[PDB]
Write a protein that binds this ligand. Structure first.
Ligand SMILES: O=C(O)[C@H]1O[C@H](O[C@@H]2[C@H](O)[C@@H](O)[C@@H](O)O[C@@H]2C(=O)O)[C@H](O)[C@@H](O)[C@H]1O
Ligand SMILES: [Ca+2]
Ligand SMILES: [Ca+2]
Ligand SMILES: [Ca+2]
Ligand SMILES: [Ca+2]
Ligand SMILES: [Ca+2]
Ligand SMILES: [Ca+2]
Ligand SMILES: [Ca+2]
Ligand SMILES: [Ca+2]
Ligand SMILES: [Ca+2]
Ligand SMILES: [Ca+2]
Length: 583
C-alpha cells in the first residue's frame, strides 16, 4: 500500500554557475512519467517544448532573476512553483545563532560547533527546515569520562530564521552516541515533529523546562547514570514540548549492558520505520555490544504509544545480542511492504521479532539497499569490528541473512561502503579493508576509493560518488583511483575522524543529493546543491521509501549515507513510481 510521505514544494533551486543559471527541481512522487515541465525566468517560459528532466540551465539568467517551474500534467500547464531567487554562491548560507560557550562544574570551558543535522518540514510550507544539533567542545565518546556542555538543538528555516532552540540541559551527556534525534512527521499532519531522548532540565523551544529544572544526575565522571529518562516529541514549528513519556528502552542497571562505568548503557540508536507499512513509527534502541533493546513508538493523535520491544536478554532472543552497529538501516526486506530494521548483523521484523543474526557481531558501518540488482530483494553490506569474526566484511541477503559471501579480515575493519562506482559489474560495489568487491564478491583489481565514508549522488550519472570530510570524490573505475569533485573550502565536517557532513540529503532541486556543512566557525550552515546537469529524471530521493528513512537516521551515532529502496545505478531498471500519499 501507499506510504505517507511529505508534501514537498517544487524544491526549485537556482544557482549561479559559470555556464549560466543552473536550475533544478523535484520530480515529485505524486507525479507521473508523463509529467513534463516548463521553466520561467521572471515570468517568461525558457523552453520551447516541455522538458522531461528536472534540471535546466538558463544561459541568460542573472543573479537578480527569479525562477518558477510549471508542471504540465495531461496536456495542460499547472500553477507556478514557489519563486526561487538565484544563489550568488554555489551554496546557500544559513546563518546560525551560535550559542555562547560555557563552563562545566569542573571549571573547564567549552565552545559550540554545529554538528549532526536532520530535516523536516516543521511549519508545513513544503520546504525542509534544518534541525541542527550543536556539539560542545567537551563532548564525549561513551568510553571517555568527563563533563560535557549542554546539547542544543536548533531549528532553522533556510532563510536563517532560528525558529527555536531546545536545550537538552545538564542531564543529557553530549556525544555521538547519546542524543539521537528523529525529525519526522510522525502523526501525519504534514508538519514534522522532533523526537529525542530528554532529561530533567531539558528546556524546550518556549523556554519551558521538562521535569525538574534543578535536578542534576551527573556523576563525578560527568556521565548521567541515574535519574529518570524521557522521550519527548517536540512540536517542530516552535520546539514546544508536545508529549514526554519515560524513555524506553529503560536504563535499568548500567551493568546489564555489559559494563559498570557507563559505556554500553548509553549506546543509543533511533530510527523511523513504517512498521504498519503506511505511516511512520519511531524506533528508539539502546545498547548493541551485548544487551540490545529496540522499542518502537507511534506518535499519533497527540499520543505517544509503545508498539513493541525487542530485548536480547529475554529468552529466545539470545542471538540478537552483540550484533548492533553504531548505525542501523530501515527497509522492507521481505517484500511485505512493512519496514524491517537492519540492526548491524541482525534484523528485527516489522512486528519486533528478530529475523536473523549473522552472528558476525558489531561493526561501524552498515549498508542496506539493492546492492545486487540481479538478485531479488535487498542486500546488506556490513563491516565488523571483532577481529575473530568469521568475516570482517559480510554481504548478505537482507531478508534471510544468509551470507552470499564474506571475506575474513582478521582485524577491526572499521569502515565499509556500498555504491555503484563501477559499471563493469552489475550492482553496487562494496569496499572495506583495502579491497573493492562486486556485489557477487569478486575482488575488483586492486585499490579502493580514497574514502570509506559516504556515497553521494552528486554528478549527472547513475554511479554514486564518495563524500568524506568537506570533499566529494568520484571513483575512476577504469584507472582504480579516486578523483576529487568538490572541496568545500571554509566548510568543515564533524565528529572528528568520522568526518561527516552536517547533512547529506536530496532536499532541494533534482534527485542529486545536497550536502550541508557548517562553516569552520559554526556561524553558518552551507547548503551545497550540485550544478552538474543530468539527463536522468528520478523522483526526489525524499520520496523513496528507504532513502527518506535513511535521512531520518543519518544523524544517529556514526552517520551512514542513505540508500534507495531500488537499485539506482548503471543499468538500473526504470525506477518504480513511488507508492505514496501526502497529508
Ligand atoms: O572512523 C573513525 O574515525 C574511527 O571510528 C572509531 O573511533 C570512534 C571515534 O571516532 C574515536 O575518536 C574514539 O572516540 O572511539 C570511537 C569508537 O571506538 O567507536 C574506531 O575505533 C577508529 O579506529 C576509527 O575507525
Ligand atoms: Ca517547512
Ligand atoms: Ca507532525
Ligand atoms: Ca518488510
Ligand atoms: Ca516483515
Ligand atoms: Ca564500533
Ligand atoms: Ca538485489
Ligand atoms: Ca556497478
Ligand atoms: Ca553519480
Ligand atoms: Ca537535490
Ligand atoms: Ca552522529
Amino acid at each position: 500500500a501507499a506510504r505517507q510521505m511529505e508534501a514537498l514544494n517544487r524544491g526549485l533551486v537556482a544557482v549561479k554557475t559559470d555556464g549560466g543559471i543552473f536550475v533544478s527541481w523535484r520530480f515529485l512522487g505524486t507525479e507521473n512519467a508523463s509529467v513534463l515541465f516548463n521553466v520561467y525566468r521572471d515570468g517568461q517560459k525558457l523552453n520551447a517544448a516541455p522538458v522531461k528532466t528536472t534540471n535546466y540551465v538558463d544561459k541568460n539568467g542573472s543573479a537578480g532573476s527569479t525562477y518558477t517551474v510549471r508542471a504540465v500534467v495531461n496536456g495542460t500547464e499547472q500553477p507556478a512553483s514557489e519563486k526561487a531567487s538565484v544563489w550568488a554562491q554555489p551554496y546557500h548560507s544559513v546563518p546560525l545563532d551560535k550559542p555562547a560557550g560555557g563552563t562545566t562544574p569542573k571549571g573547564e570551558s567549552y565552545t559550540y560547533s554545529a554538528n549532526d543535522a536532520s530535516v523536516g518540514d516543521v511549519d508545513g510550507d513544503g520546504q525542509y527546515e534544518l534541525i541542527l544539533k550543536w556539539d560542545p567542545s567537551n563532548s564525549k565518546d561513551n568510553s571517555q569520562d568527563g563533563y560535557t556542555g549542554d546539547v542544543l538543538i536548533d531549528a532553522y528555516k533556510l532563510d536563517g530564521t532560528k525558529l527555536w532552540r531546545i536545550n537538552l540541559g545538564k542531564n543529557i551527556r553530549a556525544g555521538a552516541h547519546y542524543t539521537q534525534f528523529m525529525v519526522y512527521d510522525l502523526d501525519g499532519d504534514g508538519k514534522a515533529e522532533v523526537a529525542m531522548k530528554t532529561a530533567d532540565g531539558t528546556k524546550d523551544g518556549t523556554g519551558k523546562v521538562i521535569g525538574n529544572a534543578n535536578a542534576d544526575y551527573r556523576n563525578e565522571q560527568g556521565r548521567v547514570l541515574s535519574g529518570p529518562e524521557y522521550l519527548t516529541v517536540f512540536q517542530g514549528s516552535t520546539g514546544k514540548e508536545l508529549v514526554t513519556a519515560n524513555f524506553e528502552p529503560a536504563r535499568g542497571n548500567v551493568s546489564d549492558w555489559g559494563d559498570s562505568y557507563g559505556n554500553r548503557v548509553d549506546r543509543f540508536l533511533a530510527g523511523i520505520a513504517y512498521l504498519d507499512g503506511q505511516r511512520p513509527s519511531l524506533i528508539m534502541t539502546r545498547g548493541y555490544y551485548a544487551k540490545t533493546m529496540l522499542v518502537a513508538y507511534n506518535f499519533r493523535d497527540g499520543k505517544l504509544s509503545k508498539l513493541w520491544t525487542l530485548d536480547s536478554s529475554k529468552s529466545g532472543n539470545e542471538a540478537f545480542a552483540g550484533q548492533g552497529n553504531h548505525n542501523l538501516s530501515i527497509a522492507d526486506v521481505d517484500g511485505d511492504g512493512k519496514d524491517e530494521i537492519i540492526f548491524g548483523s541482525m534484523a528485527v521484523d516489522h512486528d519486533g521479532k528478530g529475523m536473523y543474526s549473522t552472528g558476525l557481531g558489531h561493526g561501524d558501518a552498515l549498508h542496506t539497499g539493492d546492492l545486487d540488482p540481479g538478485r531479488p530483494g535487498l542486500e546488506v553490506f556490513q563491516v565488523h569490528e571483532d577481529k575473530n569474526a568469521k568475516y570482517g566484511l559480510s554481504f548478505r541477503d537482507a531478508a534471510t541473512g544468509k551470507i552470499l559471501w564474506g571475506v575474513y579480515a582478521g582485524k577491526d575493519v572499521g569502515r565499509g561502503m556500498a555504491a555503484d562506482i563501477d559499471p563493469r559489474y552489475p550492482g553496487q560495489e562494496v569496499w572495506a579493508n583495502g579491497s573493492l568487491y562486486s556485489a557477487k564478491g569478486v575482488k575488483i583489481g586492486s585499490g579502493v576509493p580514497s574514502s570509506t565514508n559516504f556515497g553521494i549522488w552528486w554528478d549527472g550519472d547513475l554511479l554514486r560518488e564518495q563524500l568524506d570530510s568537506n570533499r566529494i570524490d568520484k571513483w575512476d573505475y577504469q584507472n582504480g583511483v579516486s578523483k576529487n569533485m568538490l572541496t568545500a573550502s571554509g566548510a568543515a565536517a564533524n565528529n572528528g575522524t568520522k568526518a561527516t557532513p552536517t547533512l547529506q540529503a536530496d532536499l532541494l532541486g533534482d534527485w542529486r543529493e545536497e550536502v550541508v556543512w557548517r562553516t569552520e566557525d559554526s556561524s553558518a550552515l552551507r547548503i551545497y546543491t550540485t550544478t552538474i546537469p543530468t539527463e536522468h529524471r528520478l523522483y526526489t530521493l525524499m520520496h523513496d521509501p528507504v532513502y527518506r528513512l535513511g535521512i531520518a537516521w543519518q544523524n544517529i551515532a556514526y552517520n551512514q549515507p542513505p540508500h534507495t529502496s531500488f537499485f539506482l545505478g548503471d543499468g538500473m531498471a526504470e525506477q518504480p513510481k513511488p507508492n505514496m500519499y501526502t497529508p
